[PDB]
Design an enzyme around this catalytic site. Structure first.
Site, PDB file in Angstrom:
ATOM      1  N   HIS A 225      15.277   8.549  55.297  1.00  0.00           N
ATOM      2  CA  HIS A 225      16.545   7.982  55.340  1.00  0.00           C
ATOM      3  C   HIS A 225      16.372   6.470  54.919  1.00  0.00           C
ATOM      4  O   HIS A 225      16.629   5.475  55.472  1.00  0.00           O
ATOM      5  CB  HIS A 225      17.060   7.969  56.928  1.00  0.00           C
ATOM      6  CG  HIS A 225      18.363   7.847  57.205  1.00  0.00           C
ATOM      7  ND1 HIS A 225      19.165   9.215  57.767  1.00  0.00           N
ATOM      8  CD2 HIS A 225      19.204   6.868  57.241  1.00  0.00           C
ATOM      9  CE1 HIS A 225      20.406   8.645  57.761  1.00  0.00           C
ATOM     10  NE2 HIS A 225      20.559   7.520  57.679  1.00  0.00           N
ATOM     11  N   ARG A 228      14.988   4.147  57.363  1.00  0.00           N
ATOM     12  CA  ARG A 228      15.752   3.577  58.392  1.00  0.00           C
ATOM     13  C   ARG A 228      15.646   4.187  59.968  1.00  0.00           C
ATOM     14  O   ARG A 228      16.321   3.960  60.759  1.00  0.00           O
ATOM     15  CB  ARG A 228      17.304   3.532  57.954  1.00  0.00           C
ATOM     16  CG  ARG A 228      17.144   2.375  56.857  1.00  0.00           C
ATOM     17  CD  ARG A 228      18.747   2.628  56.131  1.00  0.00           C
ATOM     18  NE  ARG A 228      19.875   2.517  56.946  1.00  0.00           N
ATOM     19  CZ  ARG A 228      20.365   1.323  57.082  1.00  0.00           C
ATOM     20  NH1 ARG A 228      19.929   0.208  56.368  1.00  0.00           N
ATOM     21  NH2 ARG A 228      21.397   1.422  57.891  1.00  0.00           N
ATOM     22  N   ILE A 259      14.531   4.949  44.554  1.00  0.00           N
ATOM     23  CA  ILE A 259      14.752   5.104  43.189  1.00  0.00           C
ATOM     24  C   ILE A 259      15.366   4.241  42.746  1.00  0.00           C
ATOM     25  O   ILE A 259      16.592   3.643  43.073  1.00  0.00           O
ATOM     26  CB  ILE A 259      15.667   6.379  43.080  1.00  0.00           C
ATOM     27  CG1 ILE A 259      15.122   7.822  43.777  1.00  0.00           C
ATOM     28  CG2 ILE A 259      15.892   6.750  41.596  1.00  0.00           C
ATOM     29  CD1 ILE A 259      13.573   8.128  42.913  1.00  0.00           C
TER      30      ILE A 259
HETATM   31  C1  LIG Z   1      22.948   0.554  54.837  1.00  0.00           C
HETATM   32  C2  LIG Z   1      22.862   2.054  54.718  1.00  0.00           C
HETATM   33  C3  LIG Z   1      23.572   2.808  55.527  1.00  0.00           C
HETATM   34  C4  LIG Z   1      23.412   4.248  55.390  1.00  0.00           C
HETATM   35  C5  LIG Z   1      22.209   4.497  54.622  1.00  0.00           C
HETATM   36  C6  LIG Z   1      21.116   3.671  54.025  1.00  0.00           C
HETATM   37  C7  LIG Z   1      21.505   2.304  53.886  1.00  0.00           C
HETATM   38  C8  LIG Z   1      20.692   1.503  53.366  1.00  0.00           C
HETATM   39  N1  LIG Z   1      21.749   5.779  54.616  1.00  0.00           N
HETATM   40  C9  LIG Z   1      20.514   6.355  53.850  1.00  0.00           C
HETATM   41  C10 LIG Z   1      21.042   6.723  52.372  1.00  0.00           C
HETATM   42  O1  LIG Z   1      21.907   7.799  52.358  1.00  0.00           O
HETATM   43  C11 LIG Z   1      19.638   7.242  51.579  1.00  0.00           C
HETATM   44  O2  LIG Z   1      18.836   8.220  52.168  1.00  0.00           O
HETATM   45  C12 LIG Z   1      18.632   5.996  51.382  1.00  0.00           C
HETATM   46  O3  LIG Z   1      19.421   4.679  51.365  1.00  0.00           O
HETATM   47  C13 LIG Z   1      18.133   6.199  50.175  1.00  0.00           C
HETATM   48  O4  LIG Z   1      17.277   5.093  50.006  1.00  0.00           O
HETATM   49  P1  LIG Z   1      17.566   4.033  48.756  1.00  0.00           P
HETATM   50  O5  LIG Z   1      18.652   3.043  49.530  1.00  0.00           O
HETATM   51  O6  LIG Z   1      16.105   3.251  48.765  1.00  0.00           O
HETATM   52  O7  LIG Z   1      17.922   4.561  47.418  1.00  0.00           O
HETATM   53  C14 LIG Z   1      22.731   6.902  55.220  1.00  0.00           C
HETATM   54  N2  LIG Z   1      22.096   8.095  55.053  1.00  0.00           N
HETATM   55  C15 LIG Z   1      23.121   9.226  55.744  1.00  0.00           C
HETATM   56  O8  LIG Z   1      22.982  10.277  55.683  1.00  0.00           O
HETATM   57  N3  LIG Z   1      24.179   8.498  56.625  1.00  0.00           N
HETATM   58  C16 LIG Z   1      24.421   7.361  56.608  1.00  0.00           C
HETATM   59  O9  LIG Z   1      25.457   6.874  57.214  1.00  0.00           O
HETATM   60  C17 LIG Z   1      23.687   6.478  56.277  1.00  0.00           C
HETATM   61  O10 LIG Z   1      22.585   6.200  57.341  1.00  0.00           O
HETATM   62  O11 LIG Z   1      23.278   5.919  58.881  1.00  0.00           O
HETATM   63  N4  LIG Z   1      24.040   5.018  55.954  1.00  0.00           N
END
Ligand SMILES: Cc1cc2c(cc1C)N(C[C@H](O)[C@H](O)[C@H](O)COP(=O)(O)O)C1=NC(=O)NC(=O)[C@]1(OO)N2
Ligand SMILES: Cc1cc2c(cc1C)N(C[C@H](O)[C@H](O)[C@H](O)COP(=O)(O)O)C1=NC(=O)NC(=O)[C@]1(OO)N2
Ligand SMILES: Cc1cc2c(cc1C)N(C[C@H](O)[C@H](O)[C@H](O)COP(=O)(O)O)C1=NC(=O)NC(=O)[C@]1(OO)N2
Ligand SMILES: Cc1cc2c(cc1C)N(C[C@H](O)[C@H](O)[C@H](O)COP(=O)(O)O)C1=NC(=O)NC(=O)[C@]1(OO)N2
Lengths: 329, 329, 329, 329
Positions: A225, A228, A259
């Site tokens: 994630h 996060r 990436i």
């Molecule tokens: C601000 C933000 C919001 C979301 C996510 C990531 C960032 C930075 N992410 C993670 C991304 O989908 C990628 O896994 C990750 O960003 C890849 O890494 P990179 O930025 O280095 O390319 C989410 N994923 C979910 O499934 N649902 C969501 O609502 C989401 O999280 O609550 N919102």
């Protein structure tokens, strides 16, 4: 891609930028995603026919221009007035799938109408029947895949957001509305309710990947994630090769996390990924130049992928998946 | 937890803080405790039922709210006027065991009277019969376990304390009074003199752990004494998994050294620990806000442990012990 | 050798220096060439007869004074008015082979006339028959080997040159003239058109090395092109020992990338290389003092190689190849 | 020991200090001696009888107070007016052997007369018969061992000394006089000419250690000459355990390079060394306070060794040799 992050920091509210860039806890897993990629070295092949180098892949029955899709990122109007519509349009024009977020600041039906065949990321809600209706909405809207996010039973503790007091401004809405931890039962409920491929996002354990195939998933995203959720979770890139071997072609295996270049896409594909997701860089391009900035990012990434593949002796992404790698320090 | 160390440095006498923070020699083992934990990555599990995530454990026949106890730290009135009584009260209210130190600045009977069922850390003394009477005092006072410190035949050389000339102020006393190296014979003497579980603190060698079980110990603490004894001693976290396998459930295996978060507790439990000890952070909270500061530290740690466990897919500490880990760089 | 790079930076146009020093992308492979060499430790042998320590090798039927040749570097008049003639003269006087570049700023026949038996580096062109005529020119001119560069189907993306807008000045010409990706078919075409040994430059995969022998190559250069082609390509020194074992004496195995001292030559030979190529340092000496500066660099390198070999107990380069190594951190 | 190096830098001529502190080439092996020791972690043993902790060893038929001897360091009057006599006296009073250097600034017969049974380090000379007479002088003078330095066929290139133009002042003489590479034949010549144990200093290859035993050596010193000979030679501490296993008690195995504390002595002995040599720190104490400074260094080292051994559960150096270790990062 480092250029535009500078541009995004300048124009974004300092606390909006940190909501975008931050991880959980000490951000050990956020940093580790990058260190994991930088430790990977590719062993290129020489002297192969590169007549028709193509970066295209088939995934979920559809062709994509690149082994890449836009990662689900919530509340894209936090970064630019046009928000998700700007990103979806550029993704469509680039031939790249776009994942509609459950917490999108524009309704999913509108984003879907942009065309370019999008994906829908599901957060398990409240009650089963609201979640399943959200799935049905996405499928009725022509979404091609349900990206079930499985690594958020609840939000990880973002120490950047507690120390900022960050909260949604008044002009950003959860346009799909007017939550709960997901289990394997929730996965089966989705799978039974849709003909679309179900893609489990946030798989890091080899046996969770095997069970995902057993559970009927069409794909998984090997992902912590973006650092996060669990702080100290292993980076997805570090589990990718093991997970690819365990799945043995039983489903698509995507990866995300750090990436930042076409070279990183090549590394991911050499480790066995079907495709990568790209999140934060797509938002930088959005916040720095809207739809045109996203389209240019995708163009640059498309060129970098093509360049990296040719220098590695790969005429196709399939050949790139057969490349060997070596870990460095 | 990093916040309050800043607060503790400001209010503490600069040489009292260094007595608290320092290690022996070049402090190679003090630093290595932290680097050891930071190299550990957890492989979280997804999609499991988290209906009733509980951080409780049974240890020495009693339930604890968290897989954690307060580590023995001498002369707690060096950090706050209420000293050990303040920490013992907060530990009791948090459901966390509290280890009474042989060199406590308040008598052990008083700390024990606070309730919350405490432990007693024994330094081998002078003569066998004074040491055994100290054991009998602890048991008469309702202490639940004898934590026999086995890695201090004598104090390691604290280069911070020689260069500070640090010495006990006049207002801090060894309230239990008005030493010698411990051997396996001393261990048998304690074991024969008490019905309480004997816990050997400072075990780092796999065969010392096996012999501890053979010797009748109810537990061990895998510990290099916070880097304060042998400089260059291996960190306990680096020996934990090997020691857990060798002991094969024959006794409780605790670990300490550098636990600074709920994520660190999760890492320790994933490596096989029954529970951790926490030392220096508890003293920072004590020196920055007394009993209320300790209680808040324990509350924050309790929340972080619960959060980390859920994100890792663990409804119980037992499930957390079955998590796999991967070492990073 | 670090001394003269300072001297080269001062006298060179800041963007010419960066064209010389730079790599592709993030320059991860450029840095890794150096880190790879610095991780290698030699296990020296003691007490052997050093009566006649000789650094000479036979390669492609000819003796060389050192296990070393000057690497192909294009447009050497970018660094000094005399350009390739200055380097070729000093290489000849040092008994070291000199690789004439396809993009030399002085015609190959002129460089060859300097004598000292040179090599010719071929870039595959346009049409087969222009490439083969270039090969025939080199052979007619008395060149001893065709160094077929196989890792440039096209130029890698030099981020230093795009951000500099660097372009060839008006006074620097491709004097051999008035391109295309190379394949194994191109290799066979060259091999069929010449009696000279064909040396494939840019081999990193063990099976590309085996196929090179099968294809009739007289040698390979294990090389990631000084980190200038695929960014993230494994360093050649990291693949050298594996490639040497796979080739099993079937052809000469050279290596380049980050050779900065006689100690580095010793490390390369201990890993199994027949000889090394040296590129950037030769250009620093050229830009800082012309032919005399190159000759002095080769003299210093010759002395360092001899010193390193003797301290390692090696009377011959063959003994140096039998030295063991150990990887450090 | 870090304290006095500060004191030595202040009082020594800046170029004399660098002659003392420097290594060859890039000083990669000088630094690696320290990094090698810092990577070693000891697994201490607990609860053993420490009634009579003794740091004494028998070596070459004589008892020593510590597992340590003063390393051969040439021209000790470069650091203090009393030079070798000051160091030899303090070594004698400390019960520590002292190695007389072939290039001593005081004749060997004078140093030997100080008593405390010293060793003689031999550089192979000119002709066999001058070298053998030097051996006979040492034996006639009551020296106990011939420390044959085998890793100096010639001096490594000290880049600190070439850039300083450093040369022997007029007041420092090679008092034993009024060179050539050593071979195994030279070793046999010494061995045949003396009843004293011959100790080969500068062994790094496992088979050189085996051959040393076969050649009749009474000991070896596993040493890269403090990083002053082959730059990039493996550190001795990194080869020690392998060499100890190969020798299988066939001779004494000493080690030197970066020993800076009693903890380092413990690490060396845990890796299997019989004893260590200490060089540069002994000269710092000499340059900062003469004989009294050396005696105090040896006292502090003696106390640190005793402390480290007890904390590790070792009553004897033999028990310290049976300790296990673990490599860190
Ligand atoms: C601000 C933000 C919001 C979301 C996510 C990531 C960032 C930075 N992410 C993670 C991304 O989908 C990628 O896994 C990750 O960003 C890849 O890494 P990179 O930025 O280095 O390319 C989410 N994923 C979910 O499934 N649902 C969501 O609502 C989401 O999280 O609550 N919102
Ligand atoms: C100031 C101080 C005093 C003591 C200890 C540690 C500190 C810092 N310790 C070590 C702790 O018990 C933990 O092992 C360590 O602190 C865990 O590391 P963390 O601080 O990073 O959490 C003691 N242990 C004993 O058995 N008896 C004691 O009297 C005790 O030593 O003399 N007094
Ligand atoms: C400026 C420059 C130009 C070229 C090369 C390298 C530099 C720095 N190189 C790479 C070198 O031959 C060595 O592989 C590398 O420099 C070794 O690394 P070191 O500098 O650290 O010693 C070339 N190789 C070819 O085959 N043909 C060429 O035209 C060439 O590339 O286009 N021109
Ligand atoms: C200034 C100096 C002089 C000598 C040596 C070392 C230094 C620093 N050394 C190396 C030491 O004997 C130890 O091997 C090393 O110093 C251990 O490392 P530490 O300083 O870190 O403890 C010598 N060795 C010989 O055999 N003959 C000599 O004349 C000698 O070299 O020419 N003179």
């Amino acid at each position: 891609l480092a250029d535009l992050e500078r541009a995004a920091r300048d124009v974004l509210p300092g606390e909006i930028f940190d909501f975008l860039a931050g991880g959980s806890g000490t951000e050990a897993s956020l940093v580790a995603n990058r260190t994991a990629l930088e430790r990977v070295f590719v062993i290129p092949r020489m002297l192969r026919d590169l007549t028709d180098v193509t970066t295209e892949i088939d995934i979920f029955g559809r062709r994509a221009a690149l082994p890449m899709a836009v990662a689900p990122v919530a509340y894209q109007r936090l970064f630019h007035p046009e928000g998700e519509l700007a990103v979806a349009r550029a993704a469509r024009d680039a031939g790249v799938p776009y994942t509609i977020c459950t917490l999108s600041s524009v309704s999913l039906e509108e984003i879907a109408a942009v065309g370019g065949r999008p994906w829908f990321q599901l957060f398990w809600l409240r009650d089963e029947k609201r979640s399943l209706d959200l799935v049905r909405r996405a499928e009725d809207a022509g979404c091609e895949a349900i990206v079930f996010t499985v690594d958020v039973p609840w939000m990880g503790r973002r120490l950047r957001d507690m120390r900022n007091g960050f909260a949604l401004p008044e002009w950003v809405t959860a346009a799909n509305f007017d939550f709960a931890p997901a289990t394997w039962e929730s996965v089966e409920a989705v799978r039974a309710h849709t003909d679309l491929p179900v893609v489990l996002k946030g798989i890091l354990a080899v046996e969770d990947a095997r069970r995902a195939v057993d559970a009927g998933a069409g794909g998984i995203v090997v992902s912590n994630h973006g650092g996060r959720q669990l702080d100290g979770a292993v980076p997805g890139i570090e589990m990718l090769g093991e997970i690819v071997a365990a799945v043995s072609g039983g489903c698509e295996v995507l990866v995300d996390g750090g990436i930042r270049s076409g070279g990183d896409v090549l590394k991911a594909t050499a480790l066995g990924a079907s495709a990568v997701l790209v999140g934060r860089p797509v938002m930088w391009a959005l916040a720095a130049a809207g739809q045109d900035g996203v389209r240019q990012l995708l163009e640059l990434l498309a060129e970098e992928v093509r360049d990296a593949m040719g220098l590695a002796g790969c005429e196709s992404v399939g050949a790139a998946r057969r490349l060997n790698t070596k870990l460095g320090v």
